Design a protein around this ligand. Structure first.
Ligand code: PLP
Ligand code: PLP
Ligand code: NTZ
Ligand code: NTZ
Lengths: 823, 823
């Protein structure tokens, strides 16, 4: 029975074995054969073959954490934007070449099968992709970390562009199954909703509740070549279904058709606002995760080590829970509920344990976007939790009274309870009172937290407030997506940079080496030729692959100012038509992202870029000095193709609206130069590379506020600037929508009348800054020496630095860049 | 491609590879190890090890039917009572020996791991076990046979006896998955409901329908050691998701919630009567199955060579559809719809093809079991099908008028349309009109069909009508459940009897061999000791393993007469109470079966049997000369435990109510004498063993009709028989329910006043027959020699005999017992 063992079921380094395992998985796991098999079956047979090398190290890692009993860190995010695991797994396991030879000799192209895989429908923007970069960095630095979230069946949609408009189609990324997850039926937990509180002896009993079940699926997340594989655990909502005729209550009408349904769509799709489904989702994931966290605290040595009623005096030493935005804020009233109501701890002990355990990360700005829940909603589905919140509040405000005697307006600004037309719980306030550290995500974001949104809280507890600038994993975003560049770098300085990215600093010694200079340059050329063709392999147009690829890829949002870029695009166009014989550096400007169903302007903006493209891409005069391409259904795998092909990185939000950005750092790493405002982590990128090496422009956060206090009047920019006067009329008159002239009615009036992000205000500096870009592009050697100057200075933005800072400053664990023997 | 073959993926009868593959499945398939594995995890790891060797043979069996395109036979049933696959797959594959030595070197006890498997919650009584026995016989006799049915997610309940009452608990046999089934998402088919018919140019169009998806699950079914592995394809109902935007039906209001709950619960649980949901299960399995039959008829071979527009002319020679009861009878109008509406053949061609394809088996008699559907129900959900049942009826009724000119009573009698308070479609008339062969299930059963229920039809087409007496598979019902008896039969006569059960006649030469005689009794005593201990390993009382094990295991139903057996248990109890010192052959009576929720007389009978056990197993006087035990949750694996332990088999239905029985045959093969009436298959069995070797009592069908014809008054029996009179008044006075004296009121008035099954009329002859059973049990060599006479004469009751007669006489294929080889 000691021979029921892992030890030798998979001889690594081996083509012969990998072809045997490929074939056993095709015929036995899949129950298919070459005659019946489809490329999807081929892809699944390979996913299962790489997969066996993954769960071997997974078993052995969790065995290790069990013997070792370290502090475990729990990262709660309602988004994990994972997108495609095959290639990431093979390079973190060093399987790439071997899988490649093996599929070749088998008659299959590994690349074409890679393209069969779906991007995991588990997230949407930068909150999700950040949790995915962080799980790769926790595994590589050996932390005992777990990702917890929901298993959405439809993710969030795929974007189809019909006639210039975004169409949102359904994403059932799980149609055929997903080879990476492992269902865990055994671990199913119930989550309770509605009910009422019966205040008995000791106290409260939350009675008469509806139950929904939480079933976990696990996915392994491999560290970079150290053999530690960590777990991402995602919950699925399952109805209890004894009802057909059960309890005995049965008869009436089936108003429990509604219980299965409403239980079932807690998992079906992702979200952006304040509705009862969103609160049910938020509580579903908090409740299940905390039950599992306590289950695992209790089994691994602490059920044994009970002393006094399995005590939690050590819980903060063995558990850290990271609360990402206020979406999992209910973890603070929920942990206080399990500890007081179920473990019978004193309120005062449980509160101590809670705040040493939980820490909060705020990821976005401007002081109203943070969750507030009506007290009557909370009263109805979570009655015990309004009770615990009210007590936390009663008690925090007495602290504030202790600190700041007698000034009463701060007690009411600080309150978790907001008054007005409808009383509400401010969840961001909940998050601060109950967390031991709060952080922002880029140095200027954290500063505005201390100075605006959270300044009262900052004055009560200055120490709580930290900064942990976002990072990007250099495995997926360099090694995986830009293999050519990762090679001419390893040739010069070695391969250790892949998990110590500050070693890219060594590259500055080659700024003047003609050989590095032409390599850096050939890789971009090679990457651009590849992209120029993919862009006609799936979809089409005519791309000059010798143009400056100018690209803005991020979600479509007015704060992000795809509109500032459109104004500059049409200026270039008006310029070329006015003087068709003038030399102009040619550009392919590519814009991509997803609106949001129901974000009307964002939908309108996508139709402007389309419209603009139809005019300038079929203009015989313009020729191919300008092409404007809207890249359809941007997502992680498309980010993997276009970001290595880019020359200019558009990072242009209004100073102060973009808390950090993370797309900005993938482009710096992949050899693109950046044009952007002094917002987010752009500030800190310009400081590492040198301001000389960055195309900064526009209004600084200082200047936005000044504009706010004099009052922003867009007519005065219209009036003093004629090319801007010209674009606006072209938009008004139907120049770009000739069939339906005032289609851009809306954009024009928002710009002119109630533009919150001050586009015209930054326009002249923008197009002058762009003019300087074109001048550098015209000089290849210099363009490429500033590119080296950027790639060499990007190490600070590795998610490995970000996570070693969370580990040592908030979680209190030491990173480890050390091998586990395995498999 | 060439190198993507089943290549050499396991060595079979090799312990060394089975331990290897065990370990791969525990670790890489299940993602557990020895620290963490539970008993269930080792069972699932053994299940996947054994399954690999099943699918290798399965793929090769289906390739082989493709290259040989044989006549394929589809066995349609709404029940498949499979009960537990691990041990049947290892002895059918000759792998048990090897697996037993592999789990044992690993430190596991394979007997405990087999016990962890759930019975497949796929069936309920005799219709289901017949279909599972037949799938094992079709495979052993090398037929290209497919079982088609519905995958129920929770079967039809698990029974719990609480306070002596049946309580039904839900069965999710699927909680942890099922390793035997392969989901096939790719092959989803849509089933249509509702709609209306557009009689256009070529004709009808069925338009505006609701769509439910029918997703198949394949389970392999292995023949005894010949390497053919056929398929059980079970359909799962899926709701079409577009509970979001499509048709913008919703997008303001939800009630599409009911289409999802109702679609999906076509699959949730099993049924017994007439409502819209039953008819939706029935049309669902018929529609999806028939698309696959045509698909596979075109695709496998006939979509490239096909002589005349892909010809259905050859379809009756390449497909046989067996219709089990009226539950699949919509296959006759569905075949016609598809051929006439979708394939454009003429109604005459398509009808010629339909009656040559379909055959009908009737399984139970009183017109109740022969479904009738209101034409209003049918006009609403299957409008085109109703148009076709009417056209079939016309044409049929013209045929009967041609044959019987002027006999109008006949026309109105044979018609498929029943008038009355609601016009109805008599579905039995549809299966007879549309089938080329109609059969009953035991010779007296098929006689009464030609004689009473279907005589008009028999008069119109005598040749259609046949008999096919049921059988039992000797693999499950002897080798598997009684390894001891199978072994001492193989020491004398070898092992060819496993697939040629008539060879057991060879054991009549050993009727007088003293060694054979004591081996047959040793085996029986070991089965009893073993079962006496299971009975108190799980559950408990004190069972004297020397007493006569008297057992009745079958559904609780008034025609099966568990009440007659109760009348005798109390006679025996009353006897001992009058003479506590008389010598009595001591008995353990065991009764088991499930009621039917909603069959109230049947839950009263379960309560009587329990109440009678409370009284007698606690009577000090009685000691252990009588014990009454109810076996809780009788299902296929309990029938495998109790049937080898039995001495006496109770088969006591009123003559003329049990069509055949099949449990009667399992008891005969395992060395138990039978006490029974001349009903169903008891008649042919008594005939095979010699009447002298059977304890036959009571009324014969000719007698039941007389008694009927003079009227049954139960009081004249009450009046002339004193032990009876005493039983009834003990029921009445509350002797068996002292806390609630008239608890068994219902029973007493049914018995006294409206017993449809003439219990008092066979009671005297019954208690006397029982005394003879007791006289013989006291003589242990004579009892064993009559057993050898019954075990040696059980060969006609092999389901291999039954299936070779369906093959030759109804399906036009020949059995083969040629071992298709290999891998
Ligand atoms: C990097 C990334 C993001 C974040 O980009 P920002 O410009 O920081 O908003 C969003 N989506 C995808 C697909 C990404 O890979
Ligand atoms: C054989 C069998 C039956 C049928 O028994 P009869 O007495 O013929 O009705 C029913 N249930 C199970 C579990 C069986 O094994
Ligand atoms: O921290 C990750 C990212 C930031 O980089 C973005 O700037 C910010 O808009 C945001 N909102 N949610 N998550 N994020
Ligand atoms: O034919 C199979 C079995 C018969 O053996 C039973 O006697 C009969 O009651 C029945 N009803 N449905 N299925 N069955």
């Amino acid at each position: 029975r000691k021979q029921i063992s892992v030890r030798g079921l998979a001889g690594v380094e081996n083509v012969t074995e990998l072809k045997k395992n490929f074939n056993r998985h095709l015929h036995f796991t899949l129950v298919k054969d070459r005659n019946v098999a489809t490329p999807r079956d081929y892809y699944f047979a390979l996913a299962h073959t790489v997969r066996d090398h993954l769960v071997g190290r997974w078993i052995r890692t969790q065995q290790h954490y069990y013997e070792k009993d370290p502090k475990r860190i729990y990262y709660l995010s309602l988004e994990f934007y994972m997108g495609r695991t095959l290639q990431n797994t093979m390079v973190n396991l060093a399987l790439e070449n071997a899988c490649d030879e093996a599929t070749y000799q088998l008659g299959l192209d590994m690349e074409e099968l890679e393209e069969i895989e779906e991007d995991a429908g588990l997230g949407n923007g930068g909150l999700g992709r950040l949790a995915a970069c962080f799980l790769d960095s926790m595994a590589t630095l050996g932390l005992a970390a777990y990702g917890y979230g929901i298993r959405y069946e439809f993710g969030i949609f795929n974007q189809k562009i019909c006639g210039g408009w975004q169409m949102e189609e359904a994403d059932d990324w799980l149609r055929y199954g997903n080879p990476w997850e492992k269902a865990r039926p055994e671990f199913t937990l119930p989550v309770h909703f509605y009910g009422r509180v019966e205040h008995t002896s000791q106290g409260a009993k939350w009675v008469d509740t509806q139950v929904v079940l939480a079933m976990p699926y696990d996915t392994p997340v491999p560290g970079y070549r150290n053999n530690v594989v960590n777990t991402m655990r995602l919950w699925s909502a399952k109805a209890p279904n004894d009802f057909n005729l059960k309890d005995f209550n049965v008869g009436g009408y089936i108003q429990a058709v509604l219980d299965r349904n409403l239980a079932e769509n807690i998992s079906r799709v992702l979200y952006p606002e304040g509705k009862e489904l969103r609160l049910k989702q938020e509580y579903f994931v908090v409740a299940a995760t905390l039950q599992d966290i306590i289950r695992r605290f209790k089994s691994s040595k602490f059920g044994c080590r009970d002393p006094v009623r399995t005590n939690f005096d050590a819980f903060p030493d063995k558990v850290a829970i990271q609360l990402n935005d206020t979406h999992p804020s209910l973890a603070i009233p929920e942990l206080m509920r399990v500890l007081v109501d179920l473990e019978r701890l004193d309120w005062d002990k449980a509160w101590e344990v809670t705040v040493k355990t939980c820490a909060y990360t705020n990821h976005t700005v401007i002081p109203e976007a943070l969750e507030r829940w009506p007290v009557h909603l909370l009263e109805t589905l979570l009655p015990r939790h309004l009770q615990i919140i009210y007590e936390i509040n009663q008690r925090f405000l007495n602290r504030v009274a202790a600190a700041f005697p007698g000034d009463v307006d701060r007690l009411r600004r600080m309150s978790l309870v907001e008054e007005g037309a409808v009383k509400r719980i401010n969840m961001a306030h909940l998050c601060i009172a109950g967390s031991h550290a709060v952080n922002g995500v880029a140095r200027i974001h954290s500063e505005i937290l201390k100075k605006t949104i959270f300044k009262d809280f900052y004055e009560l507890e200055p120490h709580k407030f930290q900064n942990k600038t976002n990072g990007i994993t250099p495995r997926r975003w360099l090694v995986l997506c830009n293999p050519g560049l990762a090679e001419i770098i390893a040739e010069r300085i070695g391969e250790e940079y892949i998990s110590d990215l500050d070693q890219l600093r060594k590259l500055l010694s080659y700024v003047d080496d003609e050989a590095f200079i032409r390599d850096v340059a050939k890789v971009k050329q090679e990457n651009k030729l590849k992209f120029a063709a993919y862009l006609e392999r799936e979809y089409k147009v005519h791309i000059n692959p010798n143009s400056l690829f100018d690209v803005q890829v991020k979600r479509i949002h007015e704060y992000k100012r795809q509109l500032l870029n459109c104004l500059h695009v049409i200026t270039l166009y008006n310029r070329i038509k006015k003087e068709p014989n003038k030399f102009v550096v040619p550009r392919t400007v590519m814009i991509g992202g997803k609106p949001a169903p129901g974000y009307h302007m964002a939908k309108m903006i996508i139709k402007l870029i389309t419209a603009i493209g139809d005019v300038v891409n079929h203009d015989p005069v313009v020729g191919d000095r300008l092409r404007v391409i809207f890249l359809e259904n941007y997502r992680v795998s498309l980010a993997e193709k276009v970001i290595p092909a880019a020359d200019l990185s558009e990072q242009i939000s209004t100073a102060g609206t973009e808390a950090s950005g993370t797309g900005n750092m993938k482009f710096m790493l992949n050899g693109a130069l950046t044009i952007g405002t002094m917002d987010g982590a752009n500030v800190e990128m310009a400081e590492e590379a040198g301001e000389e090496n960055f195309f900064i422009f526009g209004m600084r956060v200082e200047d936005v506020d000044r504009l706010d206090q004099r009052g922003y009047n867009a007519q005065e920019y219209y009036d003093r600037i004629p090319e801007l006067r010209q674009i606006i009329e072209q938009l008004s008159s139907g120049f770009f929508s000739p069939k339906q002239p005032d289609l851009f009615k809306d954009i024009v009036n928002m710009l002119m009348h109630h533009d919150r992000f001050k586009v015209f205000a930054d326009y002249e500096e923008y197009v002058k800054c762009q003019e300087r870009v074109s001048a550098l592009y015209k000089n290849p050697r210099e363009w490429t020496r500033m590119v080296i100057r950027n790639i060499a200075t990007s190490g600070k933005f590795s998610s490995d630095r970000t996570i070693a800072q969370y580990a040592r400053e908030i979680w209190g664990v030491e990173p480890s860049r050390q091998r586990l023997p395995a498999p």
